[PDB]
Copies of this chain bind each other. A is one copy, B any other.
Amino acid sequence: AQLLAANEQKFKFDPLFLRLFFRESYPFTTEKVYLSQIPGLVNMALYVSPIVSGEVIRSRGGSTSEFTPGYVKPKHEVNPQMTLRRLPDEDPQNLADPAYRRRRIIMQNMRDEELAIAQVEEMQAVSAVLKGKYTMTGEAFDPVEVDMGRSEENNITQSGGTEWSKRDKSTYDPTDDIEAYALNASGVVNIIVFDPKGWALFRSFKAVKEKLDTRRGSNSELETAVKDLGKAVSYKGMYGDVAIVVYSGQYVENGVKKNFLPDNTMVLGNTQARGLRTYGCIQDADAQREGINASARYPKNWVTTGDPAREFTMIQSAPLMLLADPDEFVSVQLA
């Protein structure tokens, strides 16, 4: 087989969630996740006479600490028959030796597993910040529930009352709702991330377009996320004080492509909220000889004998995407 260090990939393509909110990382050296282990917040030390000693504080961490990490591993073989994906400026003279062929196939595979697991970590983040709830269910795995702690006041639905659809899209102003739905924000909001038609029925109201700062030049540096994710991330501009992004990402399900965001939804919050990417242990003795229990991902190539005379190149990981404040975002169920 090939050594573990055959991972010259070092590519960051986080789908707008592992690169905007959750930009802080935390691996563990334990099977479960102890949320209390995270330091947490500070609490404004108080006045004291300058003769006596202090009242040294620790912030005591968080209370609930018994969740289960997202252990995942996808399977592929390196059957030296697959057609090589053509790349620009390729010297075809090396196609004779299988040493180049299999080496290239392995690297393409590693790309495949990383892009596959990026989708699942993204959808965990999406499940986290759209309802507060999260459900890790799957075959060869037990059903697991995760409650972030979101209040009922952060999942407002447009179905009740007068909706954005059954209105006059030429005289009604849409702002009256956004601050009314962003008052319960627990922080200043500047991101109004929109679904494909979520921004459509929103634009239809004429009051949007005249003050919508459509100029490319703006203050928020969100344009960075534009140049990397030029497919599913569209930066509309400024709504005045807040920024607007429309998301059209997809995930490859068992046989079909499915949209990340449910169509009639929207989310409001701050661009600098805190998001955890807790990682559990790697459950491979092969790692415990090398002590790589605290890592992001774990690649491994081997050749198996006996009945299945094949060989594999695996990547195992355990993301358990979490949110520091389940109440710093508000989800509008559009209608």
Chain A interfacial positions (CB closer than 8 Å to B) = 24-29, 36-39, 41-58, 70-77, 81-83, 85-86, 88, 92-93, 95-96, 108, 112-113, 115-117, 119-120, 123, 136-142, 176, 179-180, 183, 186-188, 190, 196-197, 200-201, 203-204, 209, 211, 213-221, 227, 230-238, 240-241, 246, 248, 250-259, 263, 270-272, 283, 291-292, 294-296, 312, 314, 316, 318, 328
Contact = CB atoms under 8 A, between A and B. Distances in A.
Given A188-B246, A219-B234, 11 more contacts: A44-B120, A47-B71, A55-B75, A55-B140, A56-B75, A92-B294, A187-B232, A187-B258, A188-B248, A231-B270, A256-B328
A234 B241 contact: yes
A46 B217 CA distance: 39
Task: Tell me the interface secondary structure of chain A in the complex.
Answer: loop
Contacts of A88: 25
Given A183-B200, A216-B219, A291-B96, A230 B272 contact: yes
A96 B293 CA distance: 11
A188 B120 contact: no
A253 B292 CA distance: 37
Nearest to A278: B83
Nearest to A179: B200
A165 to B, nearest CB: 11
B241 A108 contact: no
A45 B122 CA distance: 11
The 4 A-B residue pairs whose C-beta atoms are closest, nearest first, are A47-B138, A45-B120, A45-B74, A50-B283
A96 to B, nearest CB: 7
Contacts of A141: 47-49
B50 A112 contact: no
Report which residue of A200, A235, A258 has the largest number of chain B beta carbons within 10 angstroms of its beta carbon: A200
B254 A43 contact: yes
Given A112-B39, A230-B221, A270-B257, A47 B241 contact: no
